[PDB]
């Protein structure tokens, strides 16, 4: 029996491995809305499966569609790669756009058919062996995911071309197994038959308003009037099973959160392990690492042990329990979410304005501000931002001991942090900061200030600041952690001056401002001032919140596809798979429905998003589980004719 299986398993592992490659690249290629864009196309890929089962069981069977959809899948990836080269080498965008739609079909028509195809090989009441396959099969899906991430860092033609090539390798091997596959063909228009049967029955029910209206079957009492009984039996099994899925999709909206929402939180939690220098975006991989080792344990020890004590868990029992751990997983995040709040600074909102003042002169200056004054010595700054109201910024006076007063006639934008630089009694400057949140992806911004009469130019690892006016600062640019070297160039600088310099360790999430000042020998000097503190909380603390979800998703997901396959009738095995996959499609809509948040504190969203909904669904789902939909032995009922 294993012979024909290996061709199938290696195909999915090889296939889905390449599939993940396109994911990270796509968002980078085009560059809150990232949540929509990331989720929108994720759901889109799961609408196509609708086109999968219909064609598969109503036309050419299952073997043909896999081969056909495999070819069209590769073309989409290949076309997108070359079309991208056409735009840069030489309307053009239209070529790239078409690839996306073509790529989706393969991603859609393959997932349902492949799963149903594997199960067919098991026929001799091989409950344990067929289940072993599904446990093995799911372990293969994440195997590709793990390898995809590690190779991604190590070009566009190869970035797109190379992943596409593997699918061809996967495609070729699957063909070789044709002589060994156990395959079945359709015997008519199954989809059409059901369509007509449903319409006639309900139409008949509409008739006889008060004549034998009480139905002994909610729908079948009327369908039987024209159609074959065993035909009614098959639809009856599928109709009941599909009902149980109504409460399921909410859960998938609770698992996807790790893709973006948690990764966003990883930005503010970058306390780096001493041993290594893990990056923020790599945390998602931790789900892959656990799942490969966790899956064998459950099948190996846990399930046999549970049997010994006589708990006798059923598929329904596990699925209901599986949702519990996922729910409890999120509340752990909320604990971590509130914890970080003790360290992150506060940013202005709307009509609020935050002000920072930095003195770079050689003499102390006195600053007059609405309802308060600040005196800052040479090369000194305020240790924290000062918040103010836009309307309350009425009078601003600047003076130095023994110097005339100087007013400020500039303007400030509400909702933007502003910095005031003063170097002489009547010489000041107003500059915008640009950033009003934690830096994206964890990198730390850097800028510079000009004090010399002439323009200056500075370069630092592929990024250049040039033509900077005197007593005016540039805008921030972001660099990774560690230590970076930089060089300066300016006409006023004599050649003999040394422009080579090095920085201190950067860590993650910090924001420092440099200052350039003249030495007695005309050589420049470098001073550093902080604006935002470095991230403190360690990143490994996300492991707790991760383990429960992955441990809970192994018990849930594995049973989901297996239980969907068993209850399906021998004729419409693939159709139900669409229902199962269709569950995920709805899920991403709910998170998309979030749109704006009622308030700002993220801790609220992390909590109500699961507790008020997921648990309520669980109890509601349990009620439906009380109606023993598992009591259907789909394998034997057909034997009754």
């Amino acid at each position: 029996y294993p012979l024909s299986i290996f061709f199938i398993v290696v195909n999915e592992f090889c296939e889905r491995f390449s599939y993940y490659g396109m994911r990270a690249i796509l968002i980078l290629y085009f560059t809150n809305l990232s949540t929509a864009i990331y989720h929108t196309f994720v759901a889109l890929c799961y609408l196509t499966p609708i086109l999968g089962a219909l064609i598969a069981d109503s036309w050419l069977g299952k073997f043909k569609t896999i081969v056909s959809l495999s070819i069209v899948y590769t073309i989409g990836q290949a076309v997108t790669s070359v079309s991208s080269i056409n735009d840069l080498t030489d309307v053009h965008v239209v070529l790239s756009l078409i690839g996306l739609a073509l790529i989706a079909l393969g991603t859609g028509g393959i997932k349902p058919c492949v799963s149903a195809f594997g199960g067919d090989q098991f026929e001799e009441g091989q409950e344990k062996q067929r289940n072993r396959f599904f446990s093995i099969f799911y372990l293969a899906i994440n195997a590709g995911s793990l390898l995809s991430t590690i190779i991604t860092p190590m070009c566009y033609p190869l970035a797109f071309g190379v992943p596409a090539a593997l699918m061809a390798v996967a495609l070729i091997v699957f063909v070789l197994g044709s002589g060994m596959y156990k395959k079945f063909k359709p015997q008519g228009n199954i989809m059409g038959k059901v369509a007509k049967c449903i319409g006639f029955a309900i139409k008949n029910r509409f008739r006889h308003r008060s004549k034998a209206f009480p139905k002994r079957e909610h729908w079948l009492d009327w369908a039987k009037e024209k159609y074959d009984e065993r035909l009614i039996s098959q639809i009856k099994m599928v109709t009941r099973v599909m009902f149980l899925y109504i409460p399921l999709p909410m859960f998938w909206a609770l698992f996807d959160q790790q893709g973006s929402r948690w990764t966003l939180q990883a930005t503010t939690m970058s306390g780096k392990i001493g041993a290594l220098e893990i990056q923020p975006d790599q945390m998602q991989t931790v789900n892959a690492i656990l799942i490969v080792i966790m899956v064998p344990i459950f099948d190996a020890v846990l399930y046999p042990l549970i049997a010994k004590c006589g708990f006798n868990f059923t598929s329904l029992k596990k699925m209901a329990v599986g949702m519990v751990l996922a729910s409890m997983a999120f509340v752990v995040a909320a604990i971590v979410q509130v914890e970080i709040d003790k360290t992150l600074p506060v940013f202005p909102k709307g009509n609020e304005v935050q002000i920072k003042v930095l003195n770079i002169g050689n003499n102390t200056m006195n600053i007059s501000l609405p309802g308060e004054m600040v005196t800052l010595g040479p090369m000194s700054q305020t240790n924290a931002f000062m918040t103010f109201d836009v309307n309350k910024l009425t009078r601003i006076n600047i003076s130095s001991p023994g110097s005339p007063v100087t007013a400020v006639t500039d303007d400030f934008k509400q909702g933007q942090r502003h910095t005031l630089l003063v170097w002489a009694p009547n010489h000041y400057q107003v500059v915008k900061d640009g950033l009003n949140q934690k830096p994206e992806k964890g990198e730390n911004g850097i800028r510079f200030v000009n004090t010399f009469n002439e323009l200056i130019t500075i370069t630092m690892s592929g990024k250049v600041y040039a033509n900077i006016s005197s007593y005016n600062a540039s805008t921030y640019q972001f660099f990774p952690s560690g230590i970076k070297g930089f060089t300066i160039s300016s006409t006023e600088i004599p050649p003999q001056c040394q422009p080579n310099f090095n920085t201190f360790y950067l860590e993650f999430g910090s924001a420092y401002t440099y200052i350039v000042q003249r030495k007695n020998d005309s050589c420049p000097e470098v001073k550093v001032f902080e604006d935002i503190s470095a991230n403190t909380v360690n990143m490994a603390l996300q492991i707790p919140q991760y383990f429960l979800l992955t441990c809970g998703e192994v018990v849930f997901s594995v049973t989901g596809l297996e239980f969907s396959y068993s209850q399906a009738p021998s004729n419409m095995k693939s159709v139900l798979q669409a229902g199962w996959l269709l569950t995920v499609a709805v899920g991403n809509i709910i998170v998309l429905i979030v749109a704006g948040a009622g308030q700002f504190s993220k801790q609220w969203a992390e909590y109500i998003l699961f507790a008020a909904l997921l648990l309520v669904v669980c109890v509601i789902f349990a009620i439906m589980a009380r109606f023993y939909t598992y009591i259907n032995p789909a394998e034997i009922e057909a034997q009754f004719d």
Side-chain angles (χ1 to χ4, degrees):
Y1 62 90
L3 310 186
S4 55
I5 306 305
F6 299 110
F7 298 89
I8 306 169
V9 180
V10 303
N11 180 283
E12 191 65 11
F13 152 78
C14 291
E15 184 274 306
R16 298 298 295 263
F17 163 86
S18 177
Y19 159 83
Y20 284 106
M22 306 300 88
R23 175 168 309 290
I25 299 173
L26 194 161
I27 62 184
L28 303 165
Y29 172 85
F30 272 80
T31 51
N32 310 332
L33 297 184
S34 297
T35 305
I37 299 299
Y38 173 62
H39 288 181
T40 43
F41 291 105
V42 165
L44 170 56
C45 297
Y46 290 106
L47 275 302
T48 32
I50 298 294
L51 315 182
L54 303 175
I55 294 169
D57 271 8
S58 74
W59 199 4
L60 305 183
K62 296 193 297 299
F63 170 47
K64 300 295 184 179
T65 174
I66 287 285
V67 180
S68 63
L69 271 292
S70 180
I71 296 173
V72 305
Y73 200 165
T74 300
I75 301 303
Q77 295 187 6
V79 169
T80 305
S81 67
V82 63
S83 61
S84 56
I85 311 311
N86 178 270
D87 306 10
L88 68 96
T89 56
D90 295 327
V91 173
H92 308 276
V93 178
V94 178
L95 307 176
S96 302
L97 297 175
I98 295 172
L100 288 166
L102 173 53
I103 291 163
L105 290 184
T107 304
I110 292 293
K111 296 167 180 171
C113 297
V114 64
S115 179
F117 186 92
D120 290 358
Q121 301 302 141
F122 297 73
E123 81 306 347
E124 219 70 358
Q126 296 174 335
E127 301 296 347
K128 300 182 296 305
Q129 309 84 332
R130 178 164 53 85
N131 279 260
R132 279 292 189 279
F133 161 83
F134 287 143
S135 58
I136 288 291
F137 172 83
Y138 191 86
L139 173 56
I141 297 181
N142 289 337
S145 180
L146 172 54
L147 297 180
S148 178
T149 306
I150 180 167
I151 309 305
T152 302
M154 185 276 293
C155 185
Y156 273 82
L158 291 304
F160 290 75
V162 175
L166 285 75
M167 182 175 288
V169 182
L171 195 167
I172 294 159
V173 295
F174 179 75
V175 173
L176 183 62
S178 180
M180 306 301 178
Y181 300 151
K182 186 179 293 185
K183 54 200 72 58
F184 298 80
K185 293 79 63 174
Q187 318 308 334
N189 179 14
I190 304 301
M191 171 54 181
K193 291 293 296 186
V194 173
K196 299 175 182 177
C197 186
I198 296 167
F200 160 83
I202 187 172
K203 170 54 60 56
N204 184 18
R205 185 192 167 280
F206 191 4
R207 310 287 64 76
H208 325 282
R209 302 289 289 96
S210 301
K211 200 295 189 64
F213 184 83
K215 317 170 286 173
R216 306 185 179 182
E217 208 296 324
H218 81 301
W219 289 347
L220 305 189
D221 268 12
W222 318 95
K224 184 185 297 185
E225 187 65 11
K226 177 180 291 185
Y227 300 85
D228 186 0
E229 293 75 0
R230 67 187 304 173
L231 186 162
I232 296 296
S233 304
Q234 295 185 6
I235 59 178
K236 183 54 169 172
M237 290 182 290
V238 168
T239 304
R240 280 176 172 173
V241 172
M242 191 177 297
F243 182 85
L244 301 181
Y245 289 4
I246 296 172
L248 285 176
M250 173 49 189
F251 167 48
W252 287 122
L254 259 289
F255 158 80
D256 138 291
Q257 292 292 340
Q258 67 178 3
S260 65
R261 194 80 67 173
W262 289 353
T263 304
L264 168 56
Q265 184 175 48
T267 306
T268 179
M269 185 198 306
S270 52
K272 202 50 49 186
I273 295 168
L276 47 69
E277 56 193 355
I278 185 171
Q279 289 292 347
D281 59 357
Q282 301 186 29
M283 277 306 312
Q284 295 84 234
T285 303
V286 78
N287 196 295
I289 301 170
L290 296 183
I291 210 167
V292 290
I293 180 59
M294 286 300 302
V295 161
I297 304 303
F298 277 79
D299 187 7
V301 303
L302 299 180
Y303 296 147
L305 267 293
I306 294 163
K308 295 184 180 179
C309 53
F311 194 74
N312 308 333
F313 64 88
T314 59
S315 299
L316 280 294
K317 295 260 60 176
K318 287 193 289 168
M319 287 178 60
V321 171
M323 300 174 59
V324 182
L325 276 58
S327 176
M328 300 185 299
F330 246 91
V331 54
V332 172
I335 288 172
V336 179
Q337 174 57 22
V338 63
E339 156 56 9
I340 289 174
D341 299 2
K342 278 69 261 181
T343 64
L344 289 173
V346 178
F347 302 81
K349 308 181 182 182
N351 196 86
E352 305 167 342
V353 57
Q354 294 183 8
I355 297 172
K356 177 181 175 183
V357 180
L358 161 60
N359 178 20
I360 66 187
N362 297 330
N363 305 272
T364 302
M365 317 302 187
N366 303 336
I367 301 85
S368 181
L369 313 85
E372 187 173 5
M373 302 185 301
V374 181
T375 297
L376 306 178
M379 327 315 301
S380 64
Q381 69 177 19
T382 60
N383 290 330
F385 291 88
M386 300 182 298
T387 304
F388 290 95
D389 188 324
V390 173
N391 306 325
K392 294 181 178 184
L393 185 65
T394 61
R395 286 195 174 187
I396 311 177
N397 312 330
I398 295 171
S399 61
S400 191
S403 70
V405 187
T406 306
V408 177
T409 59
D410 303 72
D411 180 10
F412 306 88
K413 306 177 183 179
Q414 59 176 343
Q416 303 292 357
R417 293 192 177 185
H418 298 277
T419 301
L420 171 51
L421 309 184
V422 183
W423 56 99
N426 304 263
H427 315 61
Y428 75 99
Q429 174 57 18
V430 181
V431 174
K432 174 169 180 174
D433 301 330
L435 282 173
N436 301 266
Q437 60 164 352
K438 202 71 175 182
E440 271 193 344
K441 306 180 183 180
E443 290 202 347
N444 314 276
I446 289 297
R447 64 174 179 180
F448 301 90
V449 170
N450 188 337
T451 61
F452 295 71
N453 301 82
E454 309 299 344
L455 302 176
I456 60 182
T457 297
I458 311 182
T459 297
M460 184 166 67
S461 300
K463 304 183 181 183
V464 182
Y465 307 89
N467 302 330
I468 308 177
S469 59
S470 186
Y471 295 92
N472 190 11
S474 64
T475 52
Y476 289 94
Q477 303 195 359
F478 307 88
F479 305 79
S481 66
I483 293 171
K484 314 297 178 181
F486 56 99
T487 312
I488 303 170
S489 61
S490 179
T491 63
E492 186 175 0
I493 295 171
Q496 57 271 19
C497 300
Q498 173 174 336
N500 295 329
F501 302 99
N502 298 88
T503 60
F504 53 85
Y505 210 97
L506 291 163
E507 305 187 12
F508 301 84
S510 61
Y512 304 103
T513 291
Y514 282 79
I515 304 181
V516 189
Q517 57 193 340
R518 189 193 182 91
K519 295 182 183 178
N520 297 330
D521 313 335
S522 308
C523 303
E525 186 174 355
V526 190
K527 191 174 184 186
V528 174
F529 289 79
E530 172 179 336
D531 292 2
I532 310 183
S533 63
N535 211 257
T536 57
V537 184
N538 169 276
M539 176 175 291
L541 285 299
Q542 293 193 1
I543 296 169
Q545 57 180 18
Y546 259 111
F547 184 89
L548 307 194
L549 198 60
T550 292
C551 178
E553 191 181 31
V554 167
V555 60
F556 176 88
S557 171
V558 169
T559 62
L561 66 81
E562 180 278 347
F563 165 80
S564 184
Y565 171 86
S566 172
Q567 276 58 357
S570 58
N571 295 119
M572 313 181 69
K573 303 293 290 188
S574 298
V575 176
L576 262 161
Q577 294 297 346
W580 172 242
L581 272 290
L582 174 58
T583 310
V584 168
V586 171
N588 192 31
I589 302 302
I590 299 179
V591 60
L592 189 156
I593 284 286
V594 174
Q599 56 75 48
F600 301 96
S601 184
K602 197 173 189 177
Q603 159 271 9
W604 265 82
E606 301 285 330
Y607 177 82
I608 66 179
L609 179 55
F610 87 92
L613 286 297
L614 188 58
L615 294 182
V616 176
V617 176
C618 178
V619 56
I620 292 291
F621 171 85
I623 302 303
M624 295 182 178
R626 184 57 168 79
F627 293 175
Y628 46 84
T629 307
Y630 174 83
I631 200 173
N632 307 283
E635 81 299 347
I636 192 178
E637 190 174 8
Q639 286 66 346
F640 307 152
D641 312 331

